[PDB]
PDB file of C-alpha atoms in Angstrom:
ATOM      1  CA  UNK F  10     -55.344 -34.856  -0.983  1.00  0.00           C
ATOM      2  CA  UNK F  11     -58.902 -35.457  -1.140  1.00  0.00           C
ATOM      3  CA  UNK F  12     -58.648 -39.472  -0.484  1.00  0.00           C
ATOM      4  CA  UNK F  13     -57.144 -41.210   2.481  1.00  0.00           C
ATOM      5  CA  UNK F  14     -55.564 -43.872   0.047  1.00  0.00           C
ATOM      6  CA  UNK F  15     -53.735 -41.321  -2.424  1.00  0.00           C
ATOM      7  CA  UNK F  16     -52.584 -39.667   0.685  1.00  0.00           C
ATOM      8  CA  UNK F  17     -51.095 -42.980   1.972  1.00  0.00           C
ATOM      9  CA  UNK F  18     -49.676 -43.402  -1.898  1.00  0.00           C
ATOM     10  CA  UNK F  19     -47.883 -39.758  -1.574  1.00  0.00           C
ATOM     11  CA  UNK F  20     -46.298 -40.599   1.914  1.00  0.00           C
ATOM     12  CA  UNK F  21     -45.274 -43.658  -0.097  1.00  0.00           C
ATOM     13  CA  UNK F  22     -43.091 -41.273  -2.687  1.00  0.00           C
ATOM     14  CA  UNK F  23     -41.708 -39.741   0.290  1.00  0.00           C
ATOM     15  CA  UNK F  24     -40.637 -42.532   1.826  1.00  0.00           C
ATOM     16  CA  UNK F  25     -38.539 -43.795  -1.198  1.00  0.00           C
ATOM     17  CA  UNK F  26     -37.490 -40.330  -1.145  1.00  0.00           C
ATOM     18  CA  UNK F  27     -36.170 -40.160   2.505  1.00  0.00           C
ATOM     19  CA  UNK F  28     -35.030 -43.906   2.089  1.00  0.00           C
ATOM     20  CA  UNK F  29     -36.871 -44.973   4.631  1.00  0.00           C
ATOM     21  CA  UNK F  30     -35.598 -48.908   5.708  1.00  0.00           C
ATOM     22  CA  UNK F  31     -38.270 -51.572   5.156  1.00  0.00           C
ATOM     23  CA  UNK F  32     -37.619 -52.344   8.732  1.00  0.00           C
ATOM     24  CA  UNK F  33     -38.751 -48.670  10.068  1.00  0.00           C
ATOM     25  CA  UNK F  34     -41.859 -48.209  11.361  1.00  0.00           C
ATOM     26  CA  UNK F  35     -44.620 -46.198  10.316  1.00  0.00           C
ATOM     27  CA  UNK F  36     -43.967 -43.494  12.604  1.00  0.00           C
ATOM     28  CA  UNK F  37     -40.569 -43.609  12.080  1.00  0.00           C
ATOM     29  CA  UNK F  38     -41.232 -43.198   8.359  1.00  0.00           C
ATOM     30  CA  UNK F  39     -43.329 -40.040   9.082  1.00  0.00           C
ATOM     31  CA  UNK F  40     -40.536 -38.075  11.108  1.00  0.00           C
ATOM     32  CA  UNK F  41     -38.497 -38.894   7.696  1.00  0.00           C
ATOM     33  CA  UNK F  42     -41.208 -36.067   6.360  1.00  0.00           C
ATOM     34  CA  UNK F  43     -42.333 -34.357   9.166  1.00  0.00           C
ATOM     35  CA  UNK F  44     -38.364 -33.111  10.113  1.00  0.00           C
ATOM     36  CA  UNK F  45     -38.043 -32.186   6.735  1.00  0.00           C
ATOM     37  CA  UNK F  46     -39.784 -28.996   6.136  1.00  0.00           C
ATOM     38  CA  UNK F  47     -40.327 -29.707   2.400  1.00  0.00           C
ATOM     39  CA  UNK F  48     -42.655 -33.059   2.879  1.00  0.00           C
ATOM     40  CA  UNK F  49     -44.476 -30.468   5.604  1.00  0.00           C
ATOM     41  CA  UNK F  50     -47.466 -30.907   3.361  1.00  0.00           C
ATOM     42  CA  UNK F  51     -47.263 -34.706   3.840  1.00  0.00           C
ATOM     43  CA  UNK F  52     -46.502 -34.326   7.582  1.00  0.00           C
ATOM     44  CA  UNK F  53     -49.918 -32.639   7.892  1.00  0.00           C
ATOM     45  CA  UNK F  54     -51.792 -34.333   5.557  1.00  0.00           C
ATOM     46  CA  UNK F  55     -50.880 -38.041   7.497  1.00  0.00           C
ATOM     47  CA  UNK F  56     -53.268 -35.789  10.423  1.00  0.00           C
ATOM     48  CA  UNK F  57     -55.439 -35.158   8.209  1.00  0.00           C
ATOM     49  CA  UNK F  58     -55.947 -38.231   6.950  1.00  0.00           C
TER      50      UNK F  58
END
């Protein structure tokens, strides 16, 4: 992603993906993608960005 927000918006999809609890917090919602080797992308990209 070349924007910080549509970055934030993909980690979003993710997060409904992994089911991530409203009550998790952000890191918490990041090792959801970062363990998972297909979001790996998205585990990068939250460095990135």
């Amino acid at each position: 992603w070349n924007t910080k927000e549509e970055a934030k918006q993909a980690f979003k999809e993710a997060l409904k993906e992994k089911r991530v609890p409203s009550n998790a917090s952000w890191e918490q919602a990041m090792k959801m993608i970062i363990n998972d080797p297909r979001y790996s992308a998205l585990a990068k990209l939250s460095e990135k960005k």
